[PDB]
RNA sequence: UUCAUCUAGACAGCCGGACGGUGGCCAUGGAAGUCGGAAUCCGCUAAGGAGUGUGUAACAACUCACCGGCCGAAUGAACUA
């Protein structure tokens, strides 16, 4: 539900996974503490995959992919590409897709339904997202920010976007995204809200040193809080 | 007010409910105990003067159920236990003292220390 | 503070006017040093892609201007060799400032940022569009 | 099973100090415990010192006052530091006090059982002005009356 | 959790000494003299600080 | 060099006892001879101090004081160059 970890000592999570509702990708250069995070809350229900995109470990920031598919850069190997057609099911599919912004994580904010993307963006990519993911793509941003990789968490249930964000805008972005949004802050006051967490319907984890009141704000808006063992035996 | 939990940062464990607590809010602000003293070999010769801090960093609560193996198995006088998922060290227990970081003194208690655990409300959530 | 980077070509020794990348109000950078570099007798330390120095701003806003601040390099003309076999070199050296810590006080950045600059620091490669 | 014989001093209403100490090897019981010493203080002040041994097996409650200490002479008593120096009229009732306090004594009858619990009392007024050293010293009363 | 009839057997080796004043060498608690050459054998004797 | 102990049994070491009213009393998270203040008593005794120290969260455990024997001729101290 809530859980916090950490890469090797960094808190920033999105940088290194990318959840979904039917798979995961984490990088390969972990501890065995990272990993025992993700593997014993998601158990066997989703493959998870050690993976690497154009040789580096930030594969949160170059994939973008949801429950249908997943888009890699071009940078991508053939090999790392061959690689990822193995581990996850048939059920995704996997395009190679070519890019000036070639950081596909920072530029594509998306979900299952509805995606924002970055507004230098041409036309011959969302004709591809909109073929590939099946979603509907909307060129907007948050307020002062052209990332909405970043800065704007989103999922099936609600949002958590960016901290120093006007009221209004929220408004015309719930209109849009048909969620609720909650602007806050992640990592003990980080304003990068994108990458310091990742997050599906049945799990969410962030880093450690996400404090109390943090954690309190990002279960209430994507709502998966919902018990015998406990009791006084004197 | 509501009912509340203590569930485990990284454990994701309801450790205790309310109706618990044995709070002991206030401290004493004195001299003898509302200070921390180190004293030496002889003499009762004290070499450092510490203030408490502002709020009680444990938490002293009942011998709850699921602490009933590590409290049979193995019973000491002192030592410590974990989450049920992780074995980290969660909170010790201690039936000699450790008043609490601001102090008091307890009685021979279970202290829960605030770090790496955290409390969330039970009830429905704060709807700002 | 920093992780381990395999070795580049030094391109910016002391003195180095480069060009500022984000859009923190800053116009240029000038580099003054560089953390965890070396000492020899009339030896310049010297910047490579990737790593933390200190640098003061020369023309922007009067804010940031007559203070250090420390600050990280995110392209380079100088050309290094990469592991795979191509030698690369952008078009004209760039920085991007930050806390000691690390984190960027940026928003974005505009250009292309090298590689094994993206990393080595996590928030640099959040703020990054283009990844070479 | 077995028996498992411990100990318990001070306290007046309710105490719970020492005692939880050495429940820890024993079952665990807070409210059984404070409760079960509280009857054997019943009837005794929360400023004076009881001391009692407890046997339990089975989460199970023992009281007992064995009176061999000073918890004599506190109890024919009247309830920054309080003092003892107080005057009583022991002899008369020191000859009955010695009584529940000669139980083992060890020693020749109540004429040498009587003039150490007197010495035990160092603090009272005891009898007349004073009830210790060459005011109690030699004892002229009871003596073959005990034995 | 130390079980103190081990500790007394701990600190005879530890604590239960002596130290010179000039050269700081640990020595036993009950020598008169400093085995070493270096302070030239005195008889400058403290008991090693307790905790 | 100048004192002093010693076959009328030394210093060192060993073997025994070190109990009873006792966790005495105020004192405090807890202080049982040993964190501390004034008190300092009794009984059994050949003899054992409401205790010299080590130790314990508090005990305990152990030594010293003290009382008896075991081994049986040297020994302690201050100084001079």
Redesign the interface.
């Known amino acids: 539900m809530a859980t916090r970890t950490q890469f090797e000592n960094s808190n920033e999570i999105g940088v290194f996974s990318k959840l979904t509702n039917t798979y995961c990708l984490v990088a390969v250069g972990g501890s065995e503490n990272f990993y025992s995070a993700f593997e014993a809350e998601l158990g066997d229900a989703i493959p998870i995959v050690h993976t690497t995109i154009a040789g580096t470990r930030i594969i949160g920031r170059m994939t973008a992919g949801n429950r249908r598919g997943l888009l890699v850069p071009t940078q991508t190997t053939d090999q790392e590409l061959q690689h990822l057609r193995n581990s996850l099911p048939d059920s995704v599919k996997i395009q190679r897709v070519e890019e000036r912004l070639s950081a596909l994580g920072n530029v594509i904010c998306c979900n299952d339904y509805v995606a924002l993307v970055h507004p230098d963006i041409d036309r011959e990519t969302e004709e591809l997202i909109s073929d590939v993911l099946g979603v509907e793509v909307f060129r907007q941003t948050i307020s002062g920010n052209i990332l909405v990789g970043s800065y704007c968490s989103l999922s099936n249930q609600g949002g958590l976007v960016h901290p120093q964000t006007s009221v209004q805008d929220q408004e015309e972005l719930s209109s849009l995204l048909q969620v609720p949004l909650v602007a806050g802050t992640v990592n003990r006051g980080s304003s990068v809200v994108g990458a310091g967490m990742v997050v599906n319907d049945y799990l969410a984890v962030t880093g450690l040193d996400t404090t109390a009141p943090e954690l309190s704000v990002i279960e209430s808006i994507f709502r998966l809080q919902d018990e015998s063992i406990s009791g006084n035996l004197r | 007010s509501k009912v509340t939990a203590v569930r485990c940062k990284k454990c994701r464990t309801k450790l205790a409910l309310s109706t618990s607590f044995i709070a002991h809010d206030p401290p004493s602000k004195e001299s003898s105990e509302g200070h921390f003293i180190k004293r030496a070999?002889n003499s009762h010769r004290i070499i450092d003067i510490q203030e408490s801090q502002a709020n009680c960093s444990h938490f002293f609560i009942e011998p709850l159920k699921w602490m009933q193996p590590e409290l049979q198995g193995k019973q000491?006088?002192?030592?410590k236990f974990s989450c049920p998922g992780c074995s980290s060290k969660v909170g010790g227990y201690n039936w000699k003292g450790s008043r609490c970081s601001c102090g008091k003194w307890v009685i021979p208690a279970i202290h829960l220390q605030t770090s790496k655990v955290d409390q969330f409300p039970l009830q429905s959530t704060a709807l700002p | 503070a920093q992780g381990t980077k395999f070795r580049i070509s030094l391109g910016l020794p002391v003195g180095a006017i480069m060009n500022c990348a984000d859009n923190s109000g800053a116009r240029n950078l000038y580099i003054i040093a560089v953390k965890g570099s070396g000492s020899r007798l009339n030896r310049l330390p010297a910047a490579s892609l990737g790593d933390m120095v200190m640098a003061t701003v020369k023309k922007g806003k009067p804010e940031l201007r007559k203070k250090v601040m420390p600050a990280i390099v995110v392209r380079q003309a100088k050309s290094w060799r990469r592991r795979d076999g191509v030698f690369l070199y952008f078009e004209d050296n760039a920085g991007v400032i930050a806390n000691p810590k690390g984190e960027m006080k940026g928003s974005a950045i505009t250009g292309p940022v090298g590689k094994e600059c993206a990393d080595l620091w996590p928030r640099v490669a959040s703020n990054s569009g283009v990844v070479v | 099973x077995x028996x498992x014989x411990x100990x318990x001093x001070x306290x007046x209403x309710x105490x719970x100090x020492x005692x939880x100490x050495x429940x820890x090897x024993x079952x665990x019981x807070x409210x059984x415990x404070x409760x079960x010493x509280x009857x054997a203080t019943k009837e005794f002040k929360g400023i004076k010192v009881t001391v009692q041994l407890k046997i339990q097996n089975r989460q199970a409650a023992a009281s007992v006052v064995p009176s061999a200490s000073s918890l004599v002479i506190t109890a024919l008593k009247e309830p920054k530091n309080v003092k003892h120096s107080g005057n009583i009229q022991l002899d008369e009732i020191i000859x009955x006090x010695x009584x529940x306090x000669x139980x083992x004594x060890x020693x020749x009858x109540x004429x040498x059982x009587x003039x150490x619990x007197x010495x035990x009392x160092x603090x009272x007024x005891x009898x007349x002005x004073x009830x210790x050293x060459x005011x109690x010293x030699x004892x002229x009363x009871x003596x073959x009356x005990x034995x | 959790?130390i079980e103190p009839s081990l500790k007394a057997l701990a600190s005879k080796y530890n604590c239960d000494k002596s130290v010179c004043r000039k050269c700081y060498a640990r020595l036993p608690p009950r020598a008169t003299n400093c085995r070493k050459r270096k302070c030239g054998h005195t008889n400058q004797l403290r008991p090693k600080?307790?905790?």
């Open positions: 070999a000491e006088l002192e030592g | 959790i600080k307790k905790l």
